[PDB]
């Protein structure tokens, strides 16, 4: 079927996890979070550079997806990152 790629609600929730726990958004959290999927490091470093600008810490995971949809250069990225299936 080749199901889908990486939606802002799948990382809502990744990164709500790591706001409740006071954890900082990192290259490797996010390699840490992302087994089974397709990801070249440089990427997620600019996937994660855009989201830290974005300053959702405070915000619950329905609004941080709101957030993530607003950002256009976010949505690029999130397309790219798909399973290994």
């Known amino acids: 079927q080749g199901m889908d790629f990486l939606t802002s609600t799948l990382l809502s929730g990744i990164l709500y996890d ?3 726990n006071g954890v900082a958004i990192t290259t490797g ?3 840490e979070k992302l087994h089974g999927w397709i ?6 470093e600019t996937l994660a550079y855009k989201v830290n600008t974005l300053e ?8 941080i997806e709101r957030k ?13 990152i798909q399973p290994e299936q």
């Open 18 to 20: 790591g706001f409740k």
């Open 68 to 80: 993530l949809n607003e950002s256009s250069e976010i949505q690029q990225i999130l397309k790219l």
């Open 29 to 31: 959290f996010l390699k």
């Open 39 to 44: 990801v070249d490091d440089t990427l997620l």
């Open 56 to 63: 959702l810490k405070d915000y619950g995971e329905h609004v």
